[PDB]
Amino acid sequence: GYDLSASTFSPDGRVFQVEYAMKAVENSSTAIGIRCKDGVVFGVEKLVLSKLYEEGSNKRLFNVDRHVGMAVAGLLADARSLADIAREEASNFRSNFGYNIPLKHLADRVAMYVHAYTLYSAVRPFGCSFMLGSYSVNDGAQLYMIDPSGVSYGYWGCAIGKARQAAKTEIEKLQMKEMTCRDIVKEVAKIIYIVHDEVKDKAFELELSWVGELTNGRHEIVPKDIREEAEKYAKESLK
Amino acid sequence: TQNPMVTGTSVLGVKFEGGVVIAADMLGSYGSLARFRNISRIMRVNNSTMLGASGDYADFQYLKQVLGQMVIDEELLGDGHSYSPRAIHSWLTRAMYSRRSKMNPLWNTMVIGGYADGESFLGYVDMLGVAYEAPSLATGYGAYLAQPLLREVLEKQPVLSQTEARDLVERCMRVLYYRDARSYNRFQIATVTEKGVEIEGPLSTETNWDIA
Amino acid sequence: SYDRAITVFSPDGHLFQVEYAQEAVKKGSTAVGVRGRDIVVLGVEKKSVAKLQDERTVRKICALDDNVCMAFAGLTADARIVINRARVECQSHRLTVEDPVTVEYITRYIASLKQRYTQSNGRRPFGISALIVGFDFDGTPRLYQTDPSGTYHAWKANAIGRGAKSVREFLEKNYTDEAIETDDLTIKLVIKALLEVVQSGGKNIELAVMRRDQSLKILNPEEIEKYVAEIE
Amino acid sequence: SRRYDSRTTIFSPEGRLYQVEYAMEAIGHAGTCLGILANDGVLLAAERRNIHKLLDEVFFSEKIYKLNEDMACSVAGITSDANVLTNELRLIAQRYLLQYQEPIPCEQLVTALCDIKQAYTQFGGKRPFGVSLLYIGWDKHYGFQLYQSDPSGNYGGWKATCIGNNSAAAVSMLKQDYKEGEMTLKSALALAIKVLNKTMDVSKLSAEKVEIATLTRENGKTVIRVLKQKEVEQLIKKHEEEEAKAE
Amino acid sequence: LEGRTHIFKIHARSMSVERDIRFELLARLCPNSTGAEIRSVCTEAGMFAIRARRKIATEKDFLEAVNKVIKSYAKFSATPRYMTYN
Amino acid sequence: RGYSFSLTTFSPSGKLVQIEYALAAVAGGAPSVGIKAANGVVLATEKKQKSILYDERSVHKVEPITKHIGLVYSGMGPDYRVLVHRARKLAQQYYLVYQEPIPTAQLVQRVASVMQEYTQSGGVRPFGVSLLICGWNEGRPYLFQSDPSGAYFAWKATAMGKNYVNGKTFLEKRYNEDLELEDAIHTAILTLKESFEGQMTEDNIEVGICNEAGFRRLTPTEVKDYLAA
Amino acid sequence: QIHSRKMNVSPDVNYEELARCTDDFNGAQCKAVCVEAGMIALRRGATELTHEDYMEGILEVQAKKKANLQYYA
Amino acid sequence: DRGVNTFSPEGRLFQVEYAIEAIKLGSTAIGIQTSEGVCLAVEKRITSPLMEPSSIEKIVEIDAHIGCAMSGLIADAKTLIDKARVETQNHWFTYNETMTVESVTQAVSNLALQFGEEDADPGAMSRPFGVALLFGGVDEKGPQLFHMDPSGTFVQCDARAIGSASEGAQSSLQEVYHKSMTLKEAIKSSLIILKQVMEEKLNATNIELATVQPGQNFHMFTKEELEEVIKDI
Amino acid sequence: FSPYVFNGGTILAIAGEDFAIVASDTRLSEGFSIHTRDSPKCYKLTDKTVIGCSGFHGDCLTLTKIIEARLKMYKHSNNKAMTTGAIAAMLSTILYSRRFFPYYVYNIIGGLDEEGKGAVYSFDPVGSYQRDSFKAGGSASAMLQPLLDNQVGFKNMQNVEHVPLSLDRAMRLVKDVFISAAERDVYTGDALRICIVTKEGIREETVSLRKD
Amino acid sequence: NQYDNDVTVWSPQGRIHQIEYAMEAVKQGSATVGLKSKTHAVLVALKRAQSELAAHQKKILHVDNHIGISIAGLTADARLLCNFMRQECLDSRFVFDRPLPVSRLVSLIGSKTQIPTQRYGRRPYGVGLLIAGYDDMGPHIFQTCPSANYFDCRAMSIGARSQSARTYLERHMSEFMECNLNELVKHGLRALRETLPAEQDLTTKNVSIGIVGKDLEFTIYDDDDVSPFLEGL
Structure with a gap:
């Protein structure tokens, strides 16, 4: 028994608790994010476990700051806790240094917070992965992902959850470098609809958000009209 | 702030049919010295609230930072609930009372205006926690010079129009400039209506008759 | 500091540590006490x-x-x-x-x-x-x-x-x-009760007597010996 | 974490503090420490377990420590715990002197140290101190005293006792050779020499494996001395001659 | 409670009794007593009668039996360390 | 936030297993030697780096503590560094309080008391190092050993690490009470040569001395000059 | 439905709710629900399985000991 | 292994249930609530004739209008009784009134289950209290009787029996209890049940009886009254 | 830096057989100026209790908020609304909690008790409280109290029957005493707010006084 | 076997067994239902008594003038959670003089309840709630589970044998939005009845109702006050 605490190494040099935490997020619905010239776009496949939930309930897209988004996958409690921590870090940075927190700095800080929970037996690794997206004229579009192990990397496009491999394969055909957010929204809808498994999942609702020049640097939920257009495009694609 | 360093003069305010209007000169006085002459003493809390200030300017900046952060936090959740002018007034009152009790007061005298749910608001907050709502407000030396004119006009005519309110504020600002040693010609006007919050540029009390 | 639950409930509702403490008490030297009309006597x-x-x-x-x-x-x-x-x-x-x-x-x-x-x-x-x-x-x-x-x-x-x-x-x-x-009857009662347990007898009993106003008095070996002889 | 906790302050099913018992078992492997009480002084004789041609002679003793102007102690068990407890004893004595401006009686000092030991064996989760101490001293209340202490926190006053290797044999021998109330310091030293001779089965005493200390009163002031090689050798010679004469 | 009050009956049938014995009271004196610990009380209560040379048991005999098989031998037992199934 | 329970406990037969294992780790360490001459002390060790890439002078094993005290070790290096830091801090505290260099015996006692804390404290393991302290106070040389258990002994000559029993036998055969510092250096180097398994050079070993002038680690040139014999 | 299409089923037996109250159930345990749905309908002499028979039999296959779970709420 | 705060696979806290099982070793206690008042009875369970029954205090008074009957581990109940008394007197000091029975039971229950092992308090409790308490008193709402267990659940009971003879005493109470009962009838029925369940013959020196009425305050029946009641049995 | 400022105000309370009146002015002042003309000092706590606070306004607001909060906590914990005696005892406890930095507030609690009668409680800034048939506090306490003693208390008068108080007579007395106080005291006389407490409920009345 | 002993040990399948056990603990409770219309939110709960002579345990509790909860x-x-809710609402009123929106309160609950689920020696709050309240955004119903997760539901039931109630609510979910208060309460009572085990019926002694609306502060109906709603089912 070498996998009962995060403070014990396996004889082959692994921290098994972090692997189990990673496996926890792999059992959740996929949530992809794509970076473009204008900005970044986030999509989440929200499974409707029952028809008794209000549309928008259990939202998995958060606004850590007015210029930084957040899409989560895994245990939703830990995701909300880390969203609160990111909000606190951004507010503290603004109060102390007097300007909006750079996305790379926020990602590094939150990752180090996650990493601090992967060293002691008094705490357990976070069971959630998430991606942050921001846009600024000085800094441009950015997209980062943080895993339970605390690894932060910058992505042009990333997926977290059950269908990470399929989403990554479908994203690779998007030549996202020279596209705008308008086309990326439709592409994200199509990708989410492709990766979704109807046999396993009963039904799902598409949640989208973006931050870019079109939004004047503010992270906000996509207007319902654009969501409906993207959904119709996705249905047309699966003919 | 036991010993205030950079201070501001009166802030005026009067509520009309459809909103409120606030005024304040752009001047930071270092004890009988017009040190800084291009500083705004009015802040936009949100789409339905604006806040003037007097007293220490550093305390005003600290309150600006804190209140802005609270507004950002509220806007992040996106739950459809926004701080109302009364909520901001109550929070400011509690903060000032706590600081006074700790004997580390925020040397400021703030005026809060807003227009939410089709109703106007105009409040007062002193460094000691005194807070009240009245149709017209004047802090600092305005309570002696400008307040009488506002009170007379309002007692004559309880409900004012935007043009009348702006004219009244201009006249009161002119009087304060005449009879206040720490006032400055340039000032700002902030109006809140159903269209949001608008802050007017550096207007001047050009109507300065000097018949000796 | 240390904050481990030393005494914890066991199935069947027992505090096993308390039971072990009682067992430890049972392994100690014998003691006796009698409440008299105007005297309280303790023996060991x-x-x-x-x-x-x-x-x-x-x-x-x-x-x-x-x-x-x-x-x-x-x-x-x-x-x-x-x-x-x-x-x-x-x-x-x-x-x-x-x-x-x-x-x-x-x-x-x-x-x-x-x-x-x-x-x-x-x-x-x-x-x-x-x-x-x-x-x-x-x-x-x-x-x-x-x-x-x-x-x-x-x-x-x-x-x-x-x-x-x-x-x-x-x-x-x-x-x-x-x-x-x-x-004297109470002291003899305590000594006789002890003699049912102690083996050597006499020299292996220590008696302390307290009266109403007088402070505590520890009987010397001679007094205990005299009482033991009187018992016989 | 519960898994790695050794649970050093529990009661065994038979109501025994296992850690205390094991600490006592540890003392059995330490050096032999002996103390005899005489009508005109007290003495401590200890086995110098460390014996090598390369060890240098430093300090006034290897196992006999001084605690006050009128107290001394000898330790058997783990040396580091002995050092910690000796420092604590010195601090306690100096605190008492500062508070009352009078030397601490021996019973009070032994009680304070035993309270520390008891605290360690009741709460804290730490291992008990694996050391037993023999105390000798003089006070204005009961005169010369000789005390003993154990890891459990129990102390008793003794006229002659031994702690360490072959303690039972030393206690039996003393029980047969101790004349209560009729022993001078010279007779006590002779008895200690005999006890150390028989208890250390390894060859005979060489005057380098014995550390003898004395506590006596002279001119109104307590005197604590550590016997030199000459007097120890003289005692060995006298004991050998007496044994030869008997046989 | 209803159970161990019935185990006592099924094991104290072919034995001499005072007839008027409060078996329910005996059942409630051994709350977490396994079936075996109840037969040992019955098989031991009559043991206290073979020693006194009597031929008919009594409630006081059983009470001394419970004091020995349930509360006197509880040091060893098996129930406390097995209901966790570990 | 930190285990509050001691990881060293008494085994049924009365031994502290953790301390024994620490002593085993020490025995697995590098050889070290210390000879107390009549006019100083000498400490010697081995520094066979795993390859030529390692910088010989990058890190030192014979590290000074104060102007008249130095120490050497045999065991885990990082633990030795921690102990060196604590010893220096203790010496400076003593100097500030009393305005006099810390005597070698006193520093030994303080360092040992530091070691004992880790064999009783909660959530810690014994230091896997044994120290040899040298100094010159009160016009006489001093040599001490301190083991993981917290016990310290005074030595005229000693050796730790691998093949330390053989080295101690060698010393017992070769030591003389009336030696001088130079003869002591030669004897120490020879003792190291007994169990070295390789060609000894200036960079392969370390030597330190302590005389009336004070403590100082010998330079490679002096070590080479002594190595001529 | 595969292992239940051999004995009897009232038209009003909502399998969807049955499939929801049985979570973390492997396939084999699912069959035991249908099998036990009958043995417990045989106890109360009858010829038709009813929904409360399936639901009541779900507990028997869950294998959870009675614990006087009645001081909650 | 298996710390204090661990949930069993059925969702029942292990320590709470272990404590609940410990209640069954206590002496039987019966409490009947009546429009005229509330009565509390308990068996003293004398071990040896030398022990003085007067020293066994299984019924205690919290205030002039509240009384509590204990069962289980007597030692654990002392802290809860002290907390109840302190809370009652604090309420009187602050609001110049008498705290209701429900409030006292609620406070005591809140005290229960506040046990922990890590990050609880400098001197927090290690295990739950192994006592079931019967609170009885008269308040603005009339006589009340409350039963509290280690789980912290408290319920108003018209007639509740706790302890070893709980099962069977409850059945008898259901048999005899009716809403229009009188205090004398309640005392008689409680005594009959206690006699039936008790191991030794019932007498004045092995039972405690207390009554609380709207007019009178907490009264603990003395020997003479007890003998008068037992005369009819 | 003075942590206190006197804002005036006069409280009154009369207890009757089957009612209770709590009255107050509506002037807020600071030194020689007037802050507002519509700031009553009467606060409703329950359906059968009213509290009047005068002195330093900030402490008045904080104390009222604390009292309302504690009332809600009591309702939740004890499942019943508090009585006037409970409010009085709690207020005495709260005031003494800040003995070394006392609230500059004068409190008069007026309402109905359990029996259905009228009850008026007076308070000192630190917490000394007692039941009284009528009490006046604030700026013009000295002016009002003697008249209430003479008329309501029938004091210093002989050969006069002690007819019980009537609601109409109580209202007339309140209006007359407050008009007289306004005629002389600078800090009062703007407008009068009367809070009647009866079995049916609480009714509010407003009467105009001289703005001078 | 060794991975179900603490709340800080992940299973190789990616599950925290202690949270599952807490969820089971909540499922072991008695039934409860919650609905909402365009203008009202309703909580109906079924109370059960341990013994025939014990009062039925209360389930619906006050939090503020516009929030309620069914445990x-x-x-x-x-x-403990109810006290935390009450304190948070009181602080919101004290500082901002504004009712705390239900969503923010539920977020605070989630933050509070997540902390035990990540630290050694702590346990999840073994309680599930159905929060009902009215804010500026209209009627709201929320569900909280021992795992620090909350769901915004338009209708949901939790507790023992709650699946029947959920099935009924899903079947009749199309008409909750546009029904009068009486019809909504009748729907809730019908779901609760669907939870009952055949040989039993809703009674005044085992049904409790709580209603919050636009012009109706939160109220609790119990005892004879529920007769108007039952008459008609």
């Missing part, structure tokens, strides 16, 4: 004189205050700690209430201390049972017992430690108003 |  069996030990430094009978003394069976160190706590509390009560402590007050204090230790964190239960004797301000003789679990009762006469059951049966069979008629 | 699970933890 000495495991071995050893012919080299200083009897002054092994006393199992100690005076908490002027009107209260106790004898303990179990672990000596835990006994010493409880004795010091009881003495400081007695002096504090004298300071505050301005009257001498009552036996009930001090025995309740010891019981509460033991309960707190058996329900605290990172703490082992006190492994001692105490017999507390004394005279209240009203002059009524009193006798109390304490157990590691924190329970205290008033007894006419009890015995704790090895041979507790045998001495208890002896006392139950041979306690009567006649036996407590005179102080 | 299902351990009662002490339920009281």
Whole structure:
């Protein structure tokens, strides 16, 4: 028994608790994010476990700051806790240094917070992965992902959850470098609809958000009209 | 702030049919010295609230930072609930009372205006926690010079129009400039209506008759 | 600091640590106590004189205050700690209430201390049972017992430690108003009860006597020998 | 974490503090420490377990420590715990002197150290101190005293006792050779020499494996001395001659 | 409670009794007593009668039996360390 | 936030297993030697780096503590660094309080008391190092050993690490009470040569001395000059 | 439905709710629900399985000991 | 292994249930609530004839209108009784009124289950209290009787029996209890049940009886009244 | 830096057989100026209790908020609304909690008790409270109290029957005493707010006084 | 076997067994339902008594003038959470003089309840709640589970044998938005009845109702006050 605490190494040099935490997020619905010239776009496949939930309930897209988004996958409690921590870090940075927190700095800080929970037996690794997206004229579009192990990397496009491999394969055909957010929204809808498994999942609702020049640097939920257009495009694609 | 360093003069305010209007000169006085002459003493809390200030300017900046952060936090959740002018007034009152009790007061005298749910608001907050709502407000030396004119006009005519309110504020600002040693010609006007919050540029009390 | 739950419930609703503390008490030297009309007597069996030990430094009978003394069976160190706590509390009560402590007050204090230790964190239960004797301000003789679990009762006469059951049966069979008629009768009762348990007899019994106004008196070996001879 | 906790302050099913018992078992492997009480002084004789041609002679003793102007102690068990407890004893004595401006009686000092030991064996989760101490001293209340202490926190006053290797044999021999109330310091030293001779089965005493200390009163002031090689050798010679004369 | 009050009946049938024996009271004196610990009380209560030379048991005999098979031998037992199934 | 329970406990037969294992780790360490001459002390060790890439002078094993005290070790290097830091801090505290260099015996006692804390404290393991302290106070040389258990002994000559029993036998055969510092250096180097398994050079070993002048680690040139014999 | 299409089923037996109250159930345990749905309908002499028979039999296959779970709420 | 705060696979806290099982070793206690008042009875369970029954205090008074009957581990109940008394007197000091029975039971229950092992308090409790308490008193709402267990659940009971003879005493109470009962009838029925369940013959020296009425305050029946009641049995 | 400022105000309370009146002015002042003309000092706590606070306004607001909060906590914990005696005892406890930095507030609690009668409680800034048939506090306490003693208390008068108080007579007395106080005291006389407490409920009345 | 002993040990399948056990603990509680219309939110709960002579345990509790909760699970933890809710609402009113929106309160609950689920020696709050309240955004119903997760539901039931109620609500979910208060309460009572085990019916002694609306502060109906709603089902 070498996998009962995060403070014990396996004889082959692994921290098994972090692997189990990673496996926890792999059992959740996929949530992809794509970076473009204008900005970044986030999509989440929200499974409707029952028809008794209000549309928008259990939202998995958060606004850590007015210029930084957040899409989560895994245990939703830990995701909300880390969203609160990111909000606190951004507010503290603004109060102390007097300007909006750079996305790379926020990602590094939150990752180090996650990493601090992967060293002691008094705490357990976070069971959630998430991606942050921001846009600024000085800094441009950015997209980062943080895993339970605390690894932060910058992505042009990333997926977290059950269908990470399929989403990554479908994203690779998007030549996202020279596209705008308008086309990326439709592409994200199509990708989410492709990766979704109807046999396993009963039904799902598409949640989208973006931050870019079109939004004047503010992270906000996509207007319902654009969501409906993207959904119709996705249905047309699966003919 | 036991010993205030950079201070501001009166802030005026009067509520009309459809909103409120606030005024304040752009001047930071270092004890009988017009040190800084291009500083705004009015802040936009949100789409339905604006806040003037007097007293220490550093305390005003600290309150600006804190209140802005609270507004950002509220806007992040996106739950459809926004701080109302009364909520901001109550929070400011509690903060000032706590600081006074700790004997580390925020040397400021703030005026809060807003227009939410089709109703106007105009409040007062002193460094000691005194807070009240009245149709017209004047802090600092305005309570002696400008307040009488506002009170007379309002007692004559309880409900004012935007043009009348702006004219009244201009006249009161002119009087304060005449009879206040720490006032400055340039000032700002902030109006809140159903269209949001608008802050007017550096207007001047050009109507300065000097018949000796 | 250390915050591990030393005493925890077990299935069938038992505090196994309390049971082990009682077992440890059972392995200590025997003690006896009898409540007389105008005298309270406490006796103790000495495991071995050893012919080299200083009897002054092994006393199992100690005076908490002027009107209260106790004898303990179990672990000596835990006994010493409880004795010091009881003495400081007695002096504090004298300071505050301005009257001498009552036996009930001090025995309740010891019981509460033991309960707190058996329900605290990172703490082992006190492994001692105490017999507390004394005279209240009203002059009524009193006798109390304490157990590691924190329970205290008033007894006419009890015995704790090895041979507790045998001495208890002896006392139950041979306690009567006649036996407590005179102080010498009470002392003889205590000695006879002890002799049912102690083997060598005579030299292995230490007796301490407290009367109404007089302070605690520890019978010298000659007096115990005379009483033992009179018993025969 | 519960898994790695050794649970050093529990009661065994038979009501025994296992850690205390094991600490006592550890003392059995330490050096032999002996103390005899006489009508005109007290003495401590200890086995110098460390014996090598390369060890240098430093300090006034290897196992006999001084605690006050009128107290000394000898330690058997783990040396580091002995050092910690000796420092604590010195601090306690100095605190008592500062508070009352009078030397601490021996019983009070042994009680304080035993309270520390008891605290360690009741709460804290730490291992008990694996050391037993023999105390000797003089006070204005009871005169010369000789005390003993154990890891459990139990102390008793003794006239002659031994702690360490072959303690039972030393106690038996003393029980047969101790004349209570009729022993001078010279007779006590002779008895200690005999006891050390028989208890250390390894060859005979070489005057380098014995550390003898004395506590005596002279001119109103207590004097604590550590016997030199000459006097120890003289005692060995006298004991050998006496044994030869008997046989 | 209803159970161990019935185990006592099924094991105290072919034995001499005072007839008027409060078996329910005996059942409630051994709350977490396994079936075996109840037969040992019955098989031991009559043991206290073979020693006294009597031929008919009594409730006081059973009470001494419970004091020995349930509360006197509880040091070893098996129930406390097995209901956790570990 | 930190285990509050001691990881060293008494085994049924009365031994502290953790301390024994620490002593085993020490025995697995590098050889070290210390000879107390009549006019100083000498400490010697081995520094066979795993390859030529390692910088010989990058890190030192014979590290000074104060102007008249130095120490050497045999065991885990990082533990030795921690102990060196603590010893220096203790020496400076003593100097501030008393305005006099810390005597070698006193520093030994303080360092040992530091070691004992880790064999009783909660959530810690014994230091896997044994120290050899040298100094010159009160016009006489001093040599001490301190083991993981916290016990310290005074030595006229000693050796630790691998093949330390053989080295101690060698010393017992070769030591003389009336030696000088130079002869002591030669004897120490020879003792190291007994169990070295390789060609000894200036960079392969370390030597330190302590005389009336004070403590100082010998330079490679002096070590080479001594190595001529 | 595969293992239940051999004995009897009232038209009003909502399998969807049955499939929801049985979570973390492997396939084999699912069959035991249908099998036990009958043995417990045989106890109360009848010829038709009813929904409360399936639901009541779900507990028997869950294998959870009675614990006087009645001081909650 | 298996710390204090661990949930069993069925969702029942292990320590709470272990404590609940410990209640079954206590002495039987019966409490009947009547429009005229509330009665509390308990068996003293004398071990030896030498022990003085007067020293066994299984019924205690919290205030002039509240009384509590204990069962289980007597030692654990002392802290809860002290907390109840302190809370009652604090309420009187602050609001100049008498705290209701429900409030006292609620406070005591809140005290229960506040046990922990890590990050709880400098001297927090290690295990739950192994006592079931019967609170009885008269308040603005009339006589009330409340039963509290280690789980912290408290329910108003018209007639509740706790302890070893709980099962069977409850059945008898259901048999005899009716809403229009009178205090004398309640006392008689409680005594009959206690006699039936008790191991030794019932007498004045092995039972405690207390009554609380709207007019009178907490009264603990003395020997003479007890003998008068037992005369009819 | 003075942590206190006197804002004036006069409280009154009369207890009757089957009612209770709590009255107050509506002037807020600071030194020689007037802050507002519509700031009553009467606060409703329950359906059968009213509290009047005068002195330093900030402490008045904080104390009223604390009292309302504590009332809600009591309702939740004890499942019943508090009585006037409970409010009085709690207020006495709260005031003494800040003995070394006392609230500059004068409190008069007026309402109905359990029996259905009228009850008026007076308070000092630190917490000393007592039941009284009528009490006046604030700036013009000295002016109002003697008249209430003479008329309501029938004091210093002989050969006069002690007819019980009537609601109409109580209202007339309140209006007359407050008009007289306004005629003389600078800090009062703007407008009068009367809070009648009866079995049916609480009714509010407003009467105009002289703005001078 | 070794991975179900603490809340800080992940299973190789990616599950925290202690949270599952807490969820089971909540499922072991008694039934409860919650609905909402365009203008009202309703909580109907079924109370069960341990014994025939014991009062039925209360389930619906006050939080503020516009928030209520129905508990299902351990009662002490339920009281702790209710006290936290009450304090948060009181602080919001004290600082901002504004009712706390239900969503923010539920977020605070989630933050509070997540902390035990990540630290050694702590346990999840073994209680599930059905929060109902009215804010500026209209009627709201929320569900909280021992795992620090909350769901915004338009209708949901939790507790023992709650699946029947959920099925009924899903079947009749199309008409909750546009029904009068009486019809909504009747729907809730019908779901609760669907939860009952055949040989039993809703009664005034085992049904409690709580209603919050636009012009109706939160109220609790119990005892004879529920007769108007039952008459018609």
